[PDB]
Amino acid sequence: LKDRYEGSEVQNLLDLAEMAIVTSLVQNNELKTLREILNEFVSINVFEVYLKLVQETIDSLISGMKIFYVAACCNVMSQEIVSKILEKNKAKLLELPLQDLMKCTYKI
Amino acid sequence: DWVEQLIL
Amino acid sequence: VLSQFYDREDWGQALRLLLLLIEFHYLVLLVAKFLYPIFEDSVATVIEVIETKWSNLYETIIEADKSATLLKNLRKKLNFKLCQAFM
């Protein structure tokens, strides 16, 4: 509580989790977070994390839904876009695809 | 004069 | 208007118009319409001030001119910025 009010993560590991992930938005930290989540066992974020450590379409839909559920979501969307671009470097690719607007236009 | 009154 | 009837002159007239708008809604709309019809640093600054400054009668005037407004204005501003960048 004292941390949320003065603007922690290990305590959380021991909604709010989503906001923490928002604040976090490195690879090692992500992996540790994933391990903590596995130990504890939202689902969308988990799918995204699994993809990052690495079906793809389902993960994409999950991430889009998470984004819909603001700044952090946009950041995550941009990261996913960058990752997809890296993977690309035909029909399946088009299916996956279906400033951000400018980028999309340049892509098309 | 007219352009000084417009600027004001 | 006389200057308009008579490029640099046109720019001076546009500047005068922006200055008048700053001193003063309908007027602003008329100005935007004039800018769109026409479609450097000082000009950009003026456009910016106008955007910062930015009811039924105004909408009616806009409709008469067309024969949404805010969007058209934003588009025009973007175009002007692009032009300034190219210069």
Binding site: - | - | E40, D41, S42, T45, E48, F86, M87
Partner: protein
């Protein structure tokens, strides 16, 4: 050797641009189209020098990438100068 003349022009215009940008911030608290044309001709001179360099007797010229870099710098300066000329110079004392 007009390659070197183009490099001097690039450096001079660059300082001129920096000066105008500095003078604009100064007054918040001349350049004509001829400078833009001059940078276009400068790009043409570089295209001509590189081509001649590629067909020299004895082997191609070693300055290929050196000239490609100068082309980029010249284009960047023509861009900046074109933006200033196009209205960004009359809006230097305005907040962005």
């Amino acid at each position: 050797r007009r390659k070197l003349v183009v490099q001097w022009i690039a450096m001079a215009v660059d300082m001129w641009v920096r000066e105008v940008e500095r003078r604009g911030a100064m007054a918040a608290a001349v350049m004509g189209s001829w400078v833009s044309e001059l940078l276009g001709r400068a790009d043409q001179v570089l295209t001509q020098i590189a081509g001649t360099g590629a067909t020299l007797r004895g082997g191609a010229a070693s300055d290929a990438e050196e000239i490609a870099s100068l082309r980029r710098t010249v284009k960047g300066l023509k861009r900046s100068v074109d933006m200033l000329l196009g209205g960004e110079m009359a809006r230097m004392s305005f907040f962005r």
